[PDB]
Amino acid sequence: LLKLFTTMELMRWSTLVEDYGMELRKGSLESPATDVFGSTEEGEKRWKDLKNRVVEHNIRIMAKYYTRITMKRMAQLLDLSVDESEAFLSNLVVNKTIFAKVDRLAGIINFQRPKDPNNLLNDWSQKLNSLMSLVNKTTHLIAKEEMIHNLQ
Amino acid sequence: YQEALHLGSQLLRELKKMDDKALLVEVQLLESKTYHALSNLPKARAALTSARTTANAIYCPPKLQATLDMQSGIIHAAEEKDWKTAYSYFYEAFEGYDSIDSPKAITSLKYMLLCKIMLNTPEDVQALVSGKLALRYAGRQTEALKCVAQASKNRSLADFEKALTDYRAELRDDPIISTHLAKLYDNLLEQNLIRVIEPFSRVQIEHISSLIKLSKADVERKLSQMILDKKFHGILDQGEGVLIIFDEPPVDKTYEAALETIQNMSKVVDSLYNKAKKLT
């Protein structure tokens, strides 16, 4: 639950494979795992769509960060085929992926670098940075100027 | 159809005064049929209104009454204004053609499933082909409609082309509504194109044309036609296949500025006319 709370680090599910196996083995708590897997297809949908749900949710978390993870290399570190990643993109087209940028030659995707209207984006960022430096610079300047008065 | 409509109209100019106005229903019905054949909606609405004000007091057998409602539904279905009223006209027309003629009934229910399949609802099509009432009038005609409804509920394109390919030997005698069928084909094509291209800013033409497994000729021509129609921002490419989307938000600047320049040119020229008049 702590790993699924926030800041989901890119880790291998193989460490969780034995965790789910012993989750089916131990009976002191969370015993009805065989009842979760009672149906022959419902449990397969919950497992496949569960690993799909986390392998897409981590994409939804890293989508906020503009670090350009270069998912072409991430597919190599995760040891999976690119076809099911294209199917994951087929889940993104309904998951509101309209704010993205792809490339024809390479396979690197871009979740940032828009047309960048200078009247809205650069204006907003320059407002927060410049004004934040103005009032923030105004606070500690006279605040420190009042803090140095106690030495007299 | 020109000399028949003109000679028939001039015949109406001298037959509206003659007694037994019930005979005018046939030549006005054929008048609406040839106005639809010539693709003229306003005059078909005026002459159709004449057929309504003529058949309001005249109560000829329903052989001509139901054809007025069917042709009215075709006229309203030509512009695609409202499918509910047109569906009501085809419903009353089907009530008029009930149990009187097998081809007229199968084309009446064919027109019902047509005007009702144009609004993208196959559930009522299945409800009409599953009932025992309309089951006895089923045949080779309703199979193509079941394939169109199946391709509509499945959101498939190559299956719709298969319906237009295998059944073209009952789609060869298809009426003028073939343009509307091509409008539905181009409508689902527009939905798929704005479905897969929209998330792809720049992607391969074969990587996006593989899922649809169709050639780039017709798709490229329709796309280029839609960019030439200026409905969205985009441009095609042949040598490299690069897709670029861009827009120019500040439109109200160059228009107002150009209007100020053009309007002020007349001011300066008029000033030169006043000075040129007062000096020489």
- Return the residue matching tokens 């795992």: A33
- Contacts for B247 with CB less than 8 Å, ≥ 6 apart: A115, B233
List the beta bridge partners of residue B12: none
Residue B56, token pair as written in the block: 């309001």
- Contacts for B43 with CB less than 8 Å, ≥ 6 apart: B35
How crowded is residue A85: how many other Cβ atoms within 10 Å of its Cβ?
Answer: 18
Residue A56 and residue A71 in contact, taking contact as beta carbons nearer than 8 Å:
no
Residue of A93, A103, A104 lying closest to B199 (CB–CB): A93
CA-based angle B209:B212:B218, to the nearest 5? 70
Helix (H) / strand (E) element for A67: namely none
**What is the distance in angstroms between the Cα of A105 and the nearest Cα belonging to chain B?**
8
> Cα separation of B24 and B1, whole Å?
18
> Cα separation of B121 and B142, whole Å?
16
* DSSP per residue, chain B: -HHHHHHHHHHHHHHSSSS-GGGHHHHHHHHHHHHHHTT-HHHHHHHHHHHHHHTTT----HHHHHHHHHHHHHHHHHHTS-HHHHHHHHHHHHHHTTTT-HHHHHHHHHHHHHHHHTTT-HHHHHHHHHSHHHHTT-SHHHHHHHHHHHHHHHT-SHHHHHHHHHTT---TT--TTHHHHHHHHHHHHHHHHHHHSTT-SS--HHHHHTTTT--HHHHHHHHHHHHHTTSSS----SSS----------HHHHHHHHHHHHHHHHHHHHHHHHHHHHH-
What does each C-alpha distance from A122 to A64, A67, B245 come to in angstroms?
19, 19, 21
> Cα separation of B207 and B213, whole Å?
10
- Contacts for B223 with CB less than 8 Å, ≥ 6 apart: B193, B234, B236
**What is the distance in angstroms between the Cα of B219 and the nearest Cα belonging to chain A?**
19
Method used to determine the 3D structure: cryo-EM
- Contacts for B179 with CB less than 8 Å, ≥ 6 apart: none
Residue of B199, B203, B240 lying closest to A98 (CB–CB): B199
What does each C-alpha distance from B219 to A18, A38, B14, B24, B216 come to in angstroms?
50, 48, 53, 48, 5
> Cα separation of B194 and B182, whole Å?
18
B199 contact residues in A (CB cutoff 8 A): 89, 92-93, 97-98, 100
- Closest of B83, B21, B7, B13 to residue B51, by C-alpha: B21
Residue of A nearest to B203 (CA): A104
* DSSP per residue, B165-215: HHTT---TT--TTHHHHHHHHHHHHHHHHHHHSTT-SS--HHHHHTTTT--
Tell me the residues of B at the A interface, defined by beta carbons under 8 Å apart: 195-196, 198-204, 240-243, 246-247, 249
Resolution (angstroms) equals: 8.8
**With an 8 Å Cβ cutoff, are B247 and A98 in contact?**
no
Helix (H) / strand (E) element for A27: namely none
> Cα separation of B173 and B74, whole Å?
17
What does each C-alpha distance from B149 to B120, B128, B203, B206, B268 come to in angstroms?
8, 12, 32, 29, 66
CA-based angle B93:B95:B97, to the nearest 5? 70
How crowded is residue B118: how many other Cβ atoms within 10 Å of its Cβ?
Answer: 20
Residue B265, token pair as written in the block: 């040119």
Q: Where are the beta strands (DSSP E) in A46-131?
A: none
